[PDB]
């Protein structure tokens, strides 16, 4: 798990 998400970060 990176605990990072572009979709979440941009949302």
């Amino acid at each position: 798990d990176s605990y990072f998400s572009w979709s979440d970060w941009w949302s």
């Epitope: 990072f4 998400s5 979709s7 941009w10």
Partner: antibody, heavy 121, light 107 residues
Framework: KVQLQQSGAELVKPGASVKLSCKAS????????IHWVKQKSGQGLEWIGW????????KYNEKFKDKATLTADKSSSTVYMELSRLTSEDSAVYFC??????????????WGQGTTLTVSS | QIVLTQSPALMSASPGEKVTMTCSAS?????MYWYQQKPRSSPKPWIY???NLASGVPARFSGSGSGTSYSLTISSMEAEDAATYYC?????????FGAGTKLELKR
């Protein structure tokens, strides 16, 4: 082989709607965001929005709020863009591109061949 | 609403010549992304996170900059490098591109 195969060219009357598709293969469909981009007559590029099939989450450019609608079918590895109330301004080539969601060091590493839309009476 | 201004819009170079081209931001951006496009073909990723080359991009290419001023540079021009280059920012929604810098062969 990673590949994004887009739908063929489309000629549509002003005021009608059209539904472009972007079929993905060669990778886990739910791990990558699909961005949509607009280009008129080999000009500059313009970001429309994206759909992440991992969570079902969607985001639009404010400009394309009331123009574009993004949806997906997980069982066919396909993301759709529906364009509504078409004018000559919407005549352009439309590209899809994948972007790994869970990696900060991600870039738009694979692109579709493009779909040409023409709007004319 | 972040506007990216790419200069020059047109430039020419002989093979062997060094090529620098700028992307200028109307506001501050954390990092810049670059793309190469040639006629009748979809754009290709070239640079990501300001100075990191995309997979398969030759070592002669490099990126630089911070805040409001970014640049893409070719140490030694080659014929195959003749294309249009676009910058893009991810810092501020909406995501925005430059108008492009077109690089042509000299003769």
């Amino acid at each position: 082989k990673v590949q994004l195969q887009q739908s063929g060219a489309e000629l549509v009357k002003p005021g009608a709607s059209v539904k472009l598709s972007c079929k993905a293969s060669g990778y886990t469909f739910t791990e990558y965001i699909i961005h949509w981009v607009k280009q008129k007559s080999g000009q500059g590029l313009e970001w429309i929005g994206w759909f992440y099939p991992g969570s079902g989450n969607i985001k639009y450019n404010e400009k394309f709020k009331d123009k574009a609608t993004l949806t997906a079918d997980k069982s066919s590895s396909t993301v759709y863009m529906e364009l509504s109330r078409l004018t000559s301004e919407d005549s352009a080539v439309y590209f899809c591109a994948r972007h790994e969601d869970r990696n900060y060091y991600s870039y738009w590493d694979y692109w579709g061949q493009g779909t040409t839309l023409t709007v004319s009476s | 609403q972040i506007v990216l201004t790419q200069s020059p819009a047109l430039m020419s170079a002989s093979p062997g010549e060094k090529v620098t081209m700028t992307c200028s931001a109307s506001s501050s951006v954390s990092n810049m992304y670059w793309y190469q496009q040639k006629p009748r073909s979809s754009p290709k990723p070239w640079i990501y996170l300001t100075s990191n080359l995309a997979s398969g991009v030759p070592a002669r290419f490099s990126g630089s900059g911070s805040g409001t001023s970014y640049s893409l540079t070719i140490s030694s021009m080659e014929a195959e490098d003749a294309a249009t280059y676009y910058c893009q920012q991810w810092s501020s929604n909406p995501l925005t591109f430059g108008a492009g810098t077109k690089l042509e062969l000299k003769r």
